[PDB]
């Protein structure tokens, strides 16, 4: 009977692949052949933030595109003012094994977690003047791979036990659980409206979830190995995934299939972070070969390279207004490029 | 050029910077050990000998004027490939292994495979291992009862504690391909005296001496 279920699943997969092939009449690259190349993009480092004493594992831009939080497993959450390079806050964490950080859209809270299996929320605007942890959300059983704020009271966290979760910060309990992944979840990406989000896991599949009802809508396959990063296209109808196969794949929610692959035989290192520009014409891919790359999303040819780091680019982000791109590496230096 | 209210911000930035620099200076004097094992490998026994939160558990203590911070990954139940690289800078890797599990695909072979995987690693090409061999008191009666060859088909020798233990030790220590850039210490940890902590202290002293030599340039 189990063999019967497996056979039915395989037949369903075959039917789905056949349907996708029937719907894959063309690809993005050909229809954009008449668009002139963006040219050689040569960004320069306008700032360098040097306060961390260990590897940088997460950074997140503020909604005002000036302040940014960054987490390092020296045990510190440092909030930088990128305009003036001043350290606004330096929160000491209870567990130094931080793997993720979040800056609330309102700017009032930050969140971080990691191998401690707990997501801690820090209140930045307490009257006492000292940042203090307001809630320790403990309902996971694995490392907190990522976390993101829906608002000042809702947070989504994807963990290493293969389940994502939606929390109620005030009550400290788990509001909803998102199950359906087979391998560890490595990233999260809220949609522009924050109604639905995509999570990438080690199964090489990115799953679409609707926050309110807590179901899974779609599964996107096409990667040959794990997915390290996932970014939502600003339009909110597509998202780009970076994988260990040195390939960045563009996926569409409506078509439910891959639109483009950004790779060339020269580069054989896995991705670590992916992010789009404000207009979506550029895809910024942080690599483990120490060199960030800038892909012309409409042409797939390398628009440029960002080589200013001496270790893995662990995190990459773009200001909400698209003015600058912050890259944080394992050498403890953030660099703002523009 | 700077507003009267911006120089205060710069002063706060500098004060935070000099606070976190001294915090890192303090952290640089901590001996970070990573505890590893499998099943009932006696890791609880090692913690007891030394002496709410799922995942990594940190235990800090001081012995003979040195501060140890033992990180027991414990029940992570997750792909180690995605969270082991954060321990690249650890000082030493304590590795507990049961010797009464030679009877029980085998538990000894599982431990051996885990040891090989975590010893020959992209990130632990220099960190020294400290192998603990637990439960020798019980393994004594177990080897008196049944032969060890049931676990090692190639084993050739007598069915005695000293030789069985020597063979197990040699089999574990032969798994490291890079014998020149990292050493594998060993101690039959069932010893209930303070030797259990003394051996770790000696191994960490040797490792830090080697690191200091490498920095100075002698090595």
């Amino acid at each position, epitope marked *: 009977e189990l063999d019967q279920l497996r056979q039915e699943a395989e037949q369903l997969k075959n039917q789905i692949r056949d349907a996708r092939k029937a719907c894959a009449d063309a690809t993005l690259s050909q229809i954009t052949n008449n668009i002139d190349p963006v040219g050689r993009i040569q960004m320069r480092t306008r700032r360098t933030l040097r306060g961390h004493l260990a590897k940088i594992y997460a950074m997140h831009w503020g909604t005002d595109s000036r302040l940014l939080v960054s987490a390092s497993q020296d045990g510190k959450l440092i909030i930088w003012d990128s305009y003036t390079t*001043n350290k606004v806050h330096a929160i000491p964490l209870r567990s130094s094994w931080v793997m993720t950080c979040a800056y609330a859209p309102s700017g009032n809270y930050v969140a971080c977690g990691g191998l401690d299996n707990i997501c801690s929320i820090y209140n930045l605007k307490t009257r006492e003047g000292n940042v203090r942890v307001s809630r320790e959300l403990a309902g996971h059983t694995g490392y907190l791979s990522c976390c993101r704020f829906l608002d000042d009271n809702q947070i989504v966290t994807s963990s290493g036990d293969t389940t994502c979760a939606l929390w109620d910060i005030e009550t400290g309990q788990q509001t909803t659980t998102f199950t359906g992944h087979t391998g560890d979840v490595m990233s999260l990406s809220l949609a522009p409206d924050t109604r639905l989000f995509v999570s990438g896991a080690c199964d090489a599949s990115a799953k679409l979830w609707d926050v309110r009802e807590g179901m899974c809508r779609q599964t996107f396959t096409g990667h040959e190995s794990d997915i390290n990063a996932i970014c939502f296209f600003p339009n909110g109808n597509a998202f780009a995934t970076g994988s260990d196969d040195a390939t960045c794949r563009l996926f569409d929610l409506r078509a439910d299939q891959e639109l483009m692959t950004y790779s060339h035989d020269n580069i054989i290192c896995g991705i670590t972070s992916v992010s789009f520009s404000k207009s979506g014409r550029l895809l910024l891919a942080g690599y483990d070969d120490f060199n960030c790359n800038v892909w012309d999303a409409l042409k797939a040819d390398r628009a440029g390279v960002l080589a200013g780091h001496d270790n893995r680019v662990s995190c990459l982000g773009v200001t909400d207004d698209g003015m600058a791109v912050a890259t944080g590496s394992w050498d403890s230096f953030l660099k703002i490029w523009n | *050029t700077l*507003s009267a209210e911006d120089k205060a911000a710069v002063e706060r930035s500098k004060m935070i910077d000099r606070n976190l620099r001294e915090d890192g200076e303090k952290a640089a004097r901590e001996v970070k050990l990573l505890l590893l094992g499998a099943g009932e490998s006696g890791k609880s026994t090692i913690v007891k000998q030394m002496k709410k939160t799922t995942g990594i558990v940190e235990t800090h203590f001081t012995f003979k004027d040195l501060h140890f911070k033992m990180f027991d990954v414990g029940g992570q139940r997750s792909e180690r490939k995605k969270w082991i690289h954060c321990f690249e800078g650890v000082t030493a890797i304590i590795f507990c292994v049961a010797l009464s599990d030679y009877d029980l695909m085998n538990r000894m072979h599982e431990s051996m495979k885990l040891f090989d995987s975590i010893c020959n690693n992209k990130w632990f090409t220099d960190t020294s291992i400290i192998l603990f061999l637990n439960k020798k008191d019980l393994f004594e009666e177990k080897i008196k009862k049944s032969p060890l060859t049931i676990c090692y088909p190639e084993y050739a020798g007598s069915n005695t504690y000293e030789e069985a233990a020597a063979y197990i030790q040699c089999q574990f220590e032969d798994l490291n391909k890079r014998k020149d850039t990292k050493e594998i210490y060993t101690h039959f940890t069932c010893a209930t005296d303070t030797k259990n902590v003394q051996f770790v202290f000696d191994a960490v002293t040797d490792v830090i001496i080697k690191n200091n030599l490498k920095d100075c340039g002698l090595f």
Partner: antibody
Amino acid sequence: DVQLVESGGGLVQPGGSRKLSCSASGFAFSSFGMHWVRQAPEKGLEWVAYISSGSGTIYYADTVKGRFTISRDDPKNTLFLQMTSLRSEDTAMYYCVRSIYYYGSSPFDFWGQGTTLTVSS
Amino acid sequence: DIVMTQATSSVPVTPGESVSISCRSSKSLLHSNGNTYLYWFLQRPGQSPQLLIYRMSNLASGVPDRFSGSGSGTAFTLTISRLEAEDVGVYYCMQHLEYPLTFGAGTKLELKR
């Protein structure tokens, strides 16, 4: 709750000296810069002194420079203003004010209840 | 120093009606970094002052929303949309662009009957 309780006020002859104390409770005293601001009887406010966080920078009003010394004991959560060569114009209510300076902070967000100093012969 | 000028007193107004308090500085308070450094404080009868506005447009925590700040580089206004019996007292404008910090004369908002 945040509290700044002042003490040391009273009657002083002209030319004397007096120490005003500000006991801070309910907040991280060491993270805040501090100000002393004086209000003359039936008159407006006048800024007197400022001591940064950690005592790294100090400023005085020209009317008091050289005569007042501002200090802080962080371990005891206390702020001190020692006044020497008091004049008749120095009679007033002295307020202890906290002020934290960074991006987006709100300086001058809390004032003490003030202590009355009467410099008269 | 920077000289802050206000009216000695404002016309008394009834509760529920809007009211405005003006202040002006001898020099432009608009720093090159975009921040206009000006703070508005309230001192009620027999009490210590308390911050109302900081940097000319930002409402301090715990202050009712009716209070609002505005103004150009060298002219500033604090508006109370609907007065209450608890708004009576002295309103001070203070500049933080350069040391020393110079307050204003203080406008004494008082009720009408």
